[PDB]
Symmetry: D2
């Protein structure tokens, strides 16, 4: 009956205290449709031995814990953010594996399982989310929890040649098979996991997507995470804040290219800046008549790799504006700031081009949000990296390879001069795909698949 | 009779082929008033054995030479730009002394003296400019030239504690004393040179008239200036159509404006930091002000210049990233050269001129800013105390750039200053620069030179 | 009949003009066994329109060309070294794709095919080597060459998820299928290529024998080897007098020794960090062990190579700074090239060979280390699981370089390993490499090639 | 009667808990000769409201305080270490002036004066040390202390053109004139101060070194800080630790160039490394036959400028050894470690060449220790920067300009090949100068000069 969701990041009930990130947006979407309990990190450190904080808002209940400084450091900043995140994004050169980080990662997964245990009922359907919690089912099983437990990976699962470089890949794979159901964003993610598993041990697969390894039974499946198209429509059509109501009037003959994401090296922001520079170099007709705005709030700012990409991005903004700016025209607006999601939906609506070219991305909700926010009668154009999970479904976007800056520049140019009729038909095709594959659909398919398996 | 001017940099007769830099602006100004021969580097490398190139335009004659790649490198990029420039600007940490650069520096001074020699007449009054040519009089003397030779240093002369770190300070000082007249931008520069000299040898001063090692020479101060009438004219000319638009659109935005070569002497990072402090501590200005910084690349082959440029690009991206809004860029950084004609107009329409070098011989941009202003509604000059110009632009808002909050506070005072206090500050500064004309500079120097008896 | 080998890099006939790199060592090994014509770049730039340079030494003929500055830059430094090398080593973050480099890469492959054409006979068997020449068969096909052409890739072939990021992966795959035979270093490389191919087009495999776009071709694995008999000879020769000394002085110090091009594929910083962990967690080894790293600069014009080198310099200074003593330097980092002959001898006197690349097609240094050991008292090989050699050197201490403590622990195990366990580990490794001779490599590849019927 | 010494840094009574630095070595030397009370920072942070810690050892009494994290940061790391230290060492490019640092600097001087007040007697002769405490006399005066107060500046006093860049030079000068006696390390330092003062206000000087400014009377004088030549002789001749007894035997045909200092940018370590490289480049005869050992413990490692210089030095050690090393010869031994002073005396004795080439240095005791420790019958050679205060008296050292690496290399070469007779006579001249100007002489001259002025 009752759904129990666990993730590291939560969306707070005070909704504009939100931090950038697709997982929390997704899960809140799901929970609002389902009902249930959300157990996860409050986002604060210190006071770890205080009782769980609990808030109820309609059909959702939140239970949060704090983490000690050391746990946050070893489990979150080191293992999750400087081993798993880079490795799953094919950045082995950025992995920073050390044994104490691994031990802390295991230590907090165990701790969190101790803290969740008293909240659970026999009934519960338990849904664990994302790379912070790979060991979590295994920790619940050793505490005797026999409930259905499903896992969903929000980020890519990398091929063996990358995954097996993890010193501890070994244990990770064993422990993932303690889940009853493993959900992935794309077929390639699922197949990659199954590949890694097969390299280590014999996996029997006697039915579509139903497996045995080390005598443990489990199911795999693909559920591309979505968005609430109706709600973003509503928020995108609400009035603009006064200061932006001005800027819209002033920029009446300027076209807007707009991008928004956490400042993460997975997102290819320097390559993007370079593609914009190539646009300005090779298509001088756009000078003074277009504007690229990049919103990039700091994310995980304690991890060295994140500091480096941020400094690199500041350099490129200064450089590009330094070179192509005029007294009365800044080509590139870089904002290292967090914007309310409500507001972003409006900004999307008034952008002529959404630029979403991550080097590697499990899904990318910004891409779907961009489409859902457009005025169907006069929609902008989506330029999308082929490496974003969303490219499997947003097939009518201008699909590009971000490693080819000139291909991205050309797609920006095509997007800026695209006729209304082509923009209508590209948009309506994309909108239909994301309406059919609702966050409500995601949630439904996963829970239904989970409820369908018999527990051990 | 005939004046012979020599400098490394020249102002070409094709006038919009001009490169940023105050020396060439100054000397052209001077020569236009005097008449004369300008001998110097064409700005090109290769073909060094070709005849001098000569062009005559009115009362001025240009004679230029090319330099080899190696000479340019040793004399210009290394010794002049990576030893003398940083040392004279109190940046010993940036000096890059190596013996081959010193040898090349002497080698080209000698070469240039050979090339100049056949052009000279007994008559000539010879006026050598700037740190590239410290040894030049010495080179001319060993070739038997007995003419009056004056030198003018366009940049600061540093105190002994800095100057004496130069491995070769020694020879530099000996050789400076072969000039009949040494001119400096401020009294402190003159006194600093005299100090350095006194530390090395006994200097008799029986009158600014000296003896060292039995060589007689005179010292004097001539702060370089501007043509206030001509900039008035160019500042009042119509704006290019694109800028005529921007002025209309920025009707309720105040403009803080700065322009200079991208040089570490100019304290651009500290400036950016002062602007950040303005934005941090005076939030009332958000959306209502704009700081535009124009900084063309200078001497871009010298590592220290690359470093400062990268650092400035970082700060622009950082500051805009932190204080920018969807419809408001706090800081416009342009790494581009602008025509001087156009700058005069931009000055006129700026509410505040921000000129806060860490160290500067004079700084003509400060004087240009005041000369350009509409007397009836002038902007405010915020000026570093370390710019030579601060000795005379005493009515500017004088600040210490090492204190970003003092600079922010002066920016705020400048932005809210009444019309009356703008009128009276401006009319005092304008008078000082009108009285001390580039024409006055040129006249005082030549007159002082013509007044000494040659050896 | 006649074998024609083409590679970018060649081993010169003056043998101590040799540059570090396994390809040239391999191919020379092969050619010495076979006989044949070696066509490739001389290593020099300029004079590109001069005739091919030809030298004959025994059963080998060399024919070399020069490259222009621009071709070297686009084809070698940019496309080969800053796109293909980093991508095939799973370093997409380092790829520096630009269209002019791609065009230059095509242009030089085409040019080289024009230059090779007149040397070819109908007879020939053509063997093309490495990532510089992926388009070469395609170029030869359009010039009408119907000969058997085999290709051998000396480096890894990356999985689709990486390979498909190449903007041009497309064309590369098409063109590789113009080879009759594609050879790889490990089964995984072969499978990865086949995967990439299958993602793009339908591949029929009715037998390692394939069809794509109606083109027939074969794939196979030939791990490249060494001459074990020759190194045994060169390892046992007398030491240079200076090193004869050091061996006497270091009698109670154990030597960990590593040698490779200073390449980011080799994981040198991670290696230094593993050594640091050894020194941190096993203090009993202080003053009693020594880690020497030899790392000649390779491809020093490519930014990513400069970066890794600067990082390595920093770590050497830091580690020595922290663990050194007045009479003990823990870590000897030498950014210098050593003659191969001499390296064999050093290997023989090292107690541990440390070979932990992050990613490596094969790694001959690992095989040379085993071949050089005195069978009666051999050192221990510590080997990254990511080196192709790990598929066969199964009895080395196999480690994951991303886990510095696993590497430190294996160094500790290696330093204290009993004679008996060193004898049996070494003999097992030596046998593998003796059965899989460079001669065997060459034989298998030629024999497979000679076995296909040409178009 | 009773002498009261105050400095930020103290030499602890547990003597091998000592931190590198000449001030504490000097003052302890002085106090051991005099007798007295030493009031200063314990070196610890936190517990700032605890009573002064007091220890008595013979004729010396220590009274120490802790500082809060914020006070340490503003007064010590920011103002003292990132404004005054760089400015007084002619590194305006490194000054990091901010008003909160200035306020904290004043705040702690005031606080320390409150803490000292109850310990003072009418009698006391008060001796304040170094740039941390420029305002201290002023603080004592406003609390009504009329005692003789002397100040001694251990570092250079920079010329007006540098000093006047300090936003706050103003107040600093006013407040220095509240001291009865101002002591400097060299005549140039004294003259520089007097210059700065003269630029601001009229100073009357009616006698040898006796002044009036703003109606405040005060005296100036020069007291070059020294060393205990007899004691270092003793410690230098003591047996070597067994490990070093070995190395000396093994290095019998290798000559040793040796340097030791805090890793500070004032010391010109990178320039030194470059001079060593030039020696190796231009004098290949020395390859395999010499060794340069640099000892450089981290100092003030929280200050960005110190981190920068350290990283730079690590790079140069790696680079130079990479380039000139051989399988059996490391040209350069860089050790980022603290060595006991006792041991250093011995390592000086056994060094052929002491390389002391700071870019700028108040005095430099390492230079004097280097000469005091040599075996008079077979002494090494001192190579000395002209910018070290010591160069005014160690006139027989090989004096060099560190900005000319080839001049420094040449001096190293001359030092390595100098005949015994020249080495004797250069050493005996230097030794006599430092014997005559004893730490005991320093202490005596200062106290005697102080005792000679009549208090207000
Ligand atoms: O300043 C921002 C930046 C991002 N987002 C939201 O954060 C989520 C980003 O999720 P996405 O899948 O694009 O990327 P992720 O952060 O999860 O990698 C989206 O819902 C964005 O609207 C936001 O609310 N404010
Ligand atoms: O983009 C630019 C930058 C500056 N200048 C001119 O360069 C000179 C700057 O001289 P100043 O003495 O201010 O500084 P310097 O450049 O010689 O150190 C002034 O006349 C400017 O008007 C210019 O014409 N365009
Ligand atoms: O200073 C050196 C360093 C390397 N090598 C040789 O160069 C080849 C290195 O080849 P390997 O396959 O290990 O690495 P690669 O350089 O091809 O990536 C081996 O023969 C080494 O012995 C050498 O001769 N001198
Ligand atoms: O590792 C070290 C190096 C330095 N010293 C001593 O610390 C003092 C440094 O004083 P100096 O005046 O030479 O430099 P300072 O820190 O005072 O500016 C000298 O006595 C050195 O012998 C020390 O105790 N340990
Ligand atoms: O939670 P943060 O580290 O701040 O990152 C924000 C979110 O980024 C991605 O969406 C991850 O898939 C989520 O697990 C994460 O929460
Ligand atoms: O000539 P550059 O090196 O470009 O620098 C431009 C000018 O900068 C300063 O104004 C110097 O005083 C001049 O001598 C120099 O000519
Ligand atoms: O030839 P270089 O670019 O110096 O690199 C040396 C060699 O390194 C590796 O072995 C490559 O596989 C070879 O193709 C290359 O020839
Ligand atoms: O105490 P630190 O800040 O580490 O510096 C070490 C010591 O040596 C220097 O010479 C200073 O003059 C002293 O005041 C200082 O206390």
């Amino acid at each position: 009956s009752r759904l129990v969701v666990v993730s590291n990041r939560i969306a707070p009930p005070d909704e504009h205290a939100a931090s950038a990130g697709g997982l929390a947006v997704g899960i809140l979407g799901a929970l609002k449709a389902a009902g249930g309990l959300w157990f996860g990190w409050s986002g604060e450190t210190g006071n770890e031995d205080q009782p769980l904080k609990k808030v109820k808002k309609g059909n959702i209940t939140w239970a949060s814990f704090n983490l000690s400084e050391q746990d946050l450091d070893e489990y979150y900043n080191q293992f999750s953010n400087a081993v798993l995140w880079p490795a799953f994004h094919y950045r082995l050169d950025l992995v920073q594996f050390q044994r104490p980080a691994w031990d802390g990662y295991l230590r907090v997964n165990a701790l969190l399982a101790d803290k969740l245990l008293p909240l659970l009922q026999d009934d519960d359907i338990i849904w664990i989310h994302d790379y912070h919690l790979l060991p979590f089912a295994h920790e619940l099983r050793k505490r005797g929890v026999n409930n259905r437990i499903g896992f969903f990976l929000h980020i890519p699962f990398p091929t063996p040649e990358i995954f097996n470089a993890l010193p501890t890949y070994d244990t990770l794979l064993e422990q993932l098979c303690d889940y009853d159901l493993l959900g992935f964003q794309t077929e390639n993610d699922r197949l990659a996991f199954l590949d890694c598993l097969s390299n280590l041990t014999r996996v029997t697969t006697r039915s579509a997507k139903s497996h045995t390894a080390w005598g443990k039974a489990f199911r795999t499946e693909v559920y591309p995470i979505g968005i609430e198209p109706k709600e973003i429509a509503k928020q995108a059509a609400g009035p603009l804040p006064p200061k932006l109501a001005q800027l819209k009037a002033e920029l009446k003959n300027v076209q807007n290219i707009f991008s928004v994401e956490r400042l993460d090296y997975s997102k290819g922001l320097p390559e993007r800046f370079l593609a914009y520079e190539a646009l300005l170099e090779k298509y001088p007709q756009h000078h003074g008549k277009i504007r690229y705005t990049q919103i990039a709030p700091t994310s995980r700012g304690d991890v060295q790799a994140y500091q480096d990409i941020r400094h690199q991005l500041e350099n490129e903004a200064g450089r590009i504006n330094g070179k192509y700016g005029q007294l009365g025209w800044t080509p590139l607006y870089y904002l290292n700031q967090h914007f309310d999601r409500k507001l972003l939906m409006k900004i999307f609506r008034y952008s002529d081009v959404g630029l979403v070219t991550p080097l590697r991305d499990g899904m990318n909700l910004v891409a779907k949000e961009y489409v859902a926010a457009q005025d169907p009668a006069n929609p902008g154009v989506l330029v999308l990296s082929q490496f974003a999970g969303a490219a499997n479904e947003l097939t009518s976007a201008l699909i590009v390879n971000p490693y080819d800056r000139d291909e991205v520049a050309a797609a920006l140019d095509r997007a800026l001069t695209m006729s209304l009729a082509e923009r209508i038909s590209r948009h309506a095709e994309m909108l239909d795909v994301i309406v059919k594959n609702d966050i409500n659909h995601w949630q439904e398919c996963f829970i239904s698949d989970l409820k369908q398996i018999v527990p051990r």
